[PDB]
Amino acid sequence: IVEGSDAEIGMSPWQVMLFRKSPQELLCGASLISDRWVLTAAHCLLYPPWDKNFTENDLLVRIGKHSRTRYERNIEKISMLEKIYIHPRYNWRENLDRDIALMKLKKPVAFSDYIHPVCLPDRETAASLLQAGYKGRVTGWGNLKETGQPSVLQVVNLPIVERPVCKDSTRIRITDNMFCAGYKPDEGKRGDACEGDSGGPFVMKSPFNNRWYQMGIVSWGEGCDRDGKYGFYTHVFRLKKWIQKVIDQF
């Protein structure tokens, strides 16, 4: 997260940290959507261009965290993966279309003050909030500058951007399963996701029922917080049906 601030305790009870067993290091962000499933970006697990291809027994899931490097005893919970599921049509060859993956936990996690699931959007909620100008929130332990890390969980609020503006800012072919966000060069404010925030949640608070919904997943960008450039996210509602599918089958 670039130009964000320290999250306050329990501010994102669904934030998940994908942790590598060996060497012990941060891998990606992710989110808790139930007591048995965490959502993340597919490129966090599979990306042939860098020979990255992780399996279940390769990672650990750490939920309820705030600090980036400390083992927050009695607060955080570490869970093992039972099965990973990448979207069959995930396009790592071209533009990272359908960058999404589901992870089934070995054992149901016990909720608490620091561990709680976020909501998945329905057609109505997405249609009301997913509009240009509307701000959303991104969180993660990723880098603070394009080219040190944070000590504590970071967070920024960014506005959703008009599709046309998104298209005219890159050479990468933009699809319907994506959407971009960030401030324009003349808007004064700034901020963005960055290396290490991948898989993290982009959420919005519904003004109708007061709940938080995850509308996007940190997918990709060109650099970090550069003028005229925007961060791109996986459109969660567009992939909602694949999600329900995977969940009632397994």
Binding site: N57, L60, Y71
Partner: peptide, 10 residues
């Protein structure tokens, strides 16, 4: 990163 307990390595 601070080391995590071994009982979580399966």
């Amino acid at each position: 990163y601070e080391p995590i307990p071994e009982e979580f390595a399966q």
